[PDB]
Amino acid sequence: KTVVVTTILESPYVMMKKNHEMLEGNERYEGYCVDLAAEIAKHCGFKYKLTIVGDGKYGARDADTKIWNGMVGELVYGKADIAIAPLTITLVREEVIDFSKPFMSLGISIMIKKGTPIESAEDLSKQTEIAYGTLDSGSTKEFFRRSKIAVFDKMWTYMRSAEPSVFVRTTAEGVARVRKSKGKYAYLLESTMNEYIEQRKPCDTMKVGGNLDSKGYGIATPKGSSLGNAVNLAVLKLNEQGLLDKLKNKWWYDKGECG
Amino acid sequence: KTVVVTTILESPYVMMKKNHEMLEGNERYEGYCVDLAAEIAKHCGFKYKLTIVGDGKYGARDADTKIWNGMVGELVYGKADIAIAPLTITLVREEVIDFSKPFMSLGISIMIKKGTPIESAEDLSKQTEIAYGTLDSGSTKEFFRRSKIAVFDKMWTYMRSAEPSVFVRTTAEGVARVRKSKGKYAYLLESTMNEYIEQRKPCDTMKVGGNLDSKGYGIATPKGSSLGNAVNLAVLKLNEQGLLDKLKNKWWYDKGECGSG
Incomplete structure (x- = not known):
């Protein structure tokens, strides 16, 4: 059959x-x-x-x-x-x-709107003018929550308390928020998606830095x-x-x- | 038990x-x-x-x-x-x-002696001054022999005929040959090994380029x-x-x- x-x-x-x-x-x-x-x-x-x-x-x-x-x-x-x-x-x-x-x-990667002066997770962790966040459930959020790595711990401590909320209901919202936030939001998401969207019109996003984990x-x-x-x-x-x-x-x- | x-x-x-x-x-x-x-x-x-x-x-x-x-x-x-x-x-x-x-x-990766003007497999494929090879009998050689990708096929055509031979009996030999060829040899090997040796004295090698495959x-x-x-x-x-x-x-x-570089 x-x-x-x-x-x-x-x-x-x-x-x-x-x-x-x-x-x-x-x-x-x-x-x-x-x-x-x-x-x-x-x-x-x-x-x-x-x-x-x-x-x-x-x-x-x-x-x-x-x-x-x-x-x-x-x-x-x-x-x-x-x-x-x-x-x-x-x-x-x-x-x-x-x-x-x-x-x-x-693996987890950073998506910026082109122009944004961020090249790495360490860059994000050192500043707050550019907001950054993750999907509101699931593993990327949990990766930060549980991390004992200093940079990622700093990022979680910021994200968990940031206002307005940096978390998003869907991946689609994460990417739209990067595109519609005028250089003031970066989004943490799967490298595969990030690489894909970098190749899509209107060509205004890019992946920066290395992946933060592997799966x-x-x-x-x-x-x-x-x-x-x-x-x-x-x-x-x-x-x-x-x-x-x-x-x-x-x-x-x-x-x-x-x- | x-x-x-x-x-x-x-x-x-x-x-x-x-x-x-x-x-x-x-x-x-x-x-x-x-x-x-x-x-x-x-x-x-x-x-x-x-x-x-x-x-x-x-x-x-x-x-x-x-x-x-x-x-x-x-x-x-x-x-x-x-x-x-x-x-x-x-x-x-x-x-x-x-x-x-x-x-x-x-994955397969490129090891150079620091200062070699090579950043990728495409770079290697487009010049002849710097020789390059693989372990003589294993999967990295076979990857090149079998490839339909234009850059890797161009690399394989070169390597299989290069003289003196660019293939080495052992990984240790490939690394030594990088270190001792004054920038005129690059070596294709597992990225894990390449990364490890980049962290070894005398700190004269590096990994360059993306990996050529994934395993x-x-x-x-x-x-x-x-x-x-x-x-x-x-x-x-x-x-x-x-x-x-x-x-x-x-x-x-x-x-x-x-x-840390």
């Missing part, structure tokens, strides 16, 4: 093609993860159907109900067979699903899945063949708009 | 403490992977014995006999329970042992091992808690000899 792939609309991983209403099935979608799914399927010998996660979420477990949402929930509750998306390999997720080795690396996206399957061993080997094979890097260059740089 | 850990003497992962002759067991050794082992064991609730792999090898399958050597051989043939070492996660290895998610990221070191267990799940979760936990970054900084930079 056909493998049900769960994935999520997040550019440039999975995007509606311009004329998606004229198309059907897998042909509606394009992107890094669309291309990656086709290569995984080809290397594992399976037919598949791409579906967009019903609740539009990656995967978190409610602290009160213990219920998983997003793509992880679609795996553990038996709605999909594999998630092929920019889903971070994390301890809490790894406990309930199987992950391939990472297909893309990333990876993986393909996820249920524990015991008849697909999991072959999917992981296929990720390694695609990495070694230069295909993962080719796809990253294609979707971030070849299709870039900013020179 | 005492868990048998196979590992390898490679600086700064596992090194002999200077007073090692008076010490015994795990106390003989220090380094990033010694610290990592201790953290893994704590977080999995096991006792362990570090043992240095007898043949001093990481793990490859002999072309003729098809027998695995090194640490991978120790796992495959039933001699050790876990390998805690800078063992790159590769397809051929993943087929025969289990790996944790990577505890350290790395990771993993903890390995025999396939189907009952320890694998706990070990993997411990690697992710140690990552999220910042411990892996703390160990890398400690062994590369805190204990570095060349300052």
Whole structure:
């Protein structure tokens, strides 16, 4: 039978093609993860159907109900067979699903509006004229909260008390705030997103400094899945063949708009 | 059970403490992977014995006999329970042992003698005064031989025919050749090693450019091992808690000899 792939609309991983209403099935979608799914399927010998996660979420477990949402929930509750998306390999997720080795690396990075005189986290930590913050939940916030590194501790002590609030409800809000704050806001977010947005019109943002931590996206399957061993080997094979890097260059740089 | 850990003497992962002759067991050794082992064991609730792999090898399958050597051989043939070492996660290895998610990221990188006017692989590819090569038989050479990327193919066309030969028998030789060629040799090698040597006296080398590929070191267990799940979760936990970054900084930079640039 056909493998049900769960994935999520997040550019440039999975995007509606311009004329998606004229198309059907897998042909509606394009992107890094669309291309990656086709290569995984080809290397594992399976037919598949791409579906967009019903609740539009990656995967978190409610602290009160213990219920998983997003793509992880679609795996553990038996709605999909594999998630092929920019889903971070994390301890809490790894406990309930199987992950391939990472297909893309990333880490926390700084996004400024071009012109802003900030080149690093240390620069941010030393000043307050340019506000800076993180998404209001999730791991980037938690990274600062728990850090024992002096620079990041200084940054957390500032962020947690800063007024007006430097936290944002969505990544989209973080990026809009950089763009609409006239050089007075910098936003801490995933390097992959930062690099992507740097290549998008209106070309007014840029990534600065090194990453502050390290993590990876993986393909996820249920524990015991008849697909999991072959999917992981296929990720390694695609990495070694230069295909993962080719796809990253294609979707971030070849299709870039900013020179 | 005492868990048998196979590992390898490679600086700064596992090194002999200077007073090692008076010490015994795990106390003989220090380094990033010694610290990592201790953290893994704590977080999995096991006792362990570090043992240095007898043949001093990481793990490859002999072309003729098809027998695995090194640490991978120790796992495959039933001699050790876990390998805690800078063992790159590769397809051929993943087929025969289990790996944790990577505890350290790395990629092919360029080492120059300070003052060499080279900032990237593209720079190397566009000139002929400065020679450059790789280890003579391993994955970095193969990366170039197999590449369809125009810059790397241009580099491979050059290297395979360069005279005198630009390939070296050992990593130590490649580093020495950088140091002793007055800026006329650059060497392509793992970024982790490149970073480490940049922190070694006489402080005459540096890493330049982005990495040319991405790979990771993993903890390995025999396939189907009952320890694998706990070990993997411990690697992710140690990552999220910042411990892996703390160990890398400690062994590369805190204990570095060349300052911060």
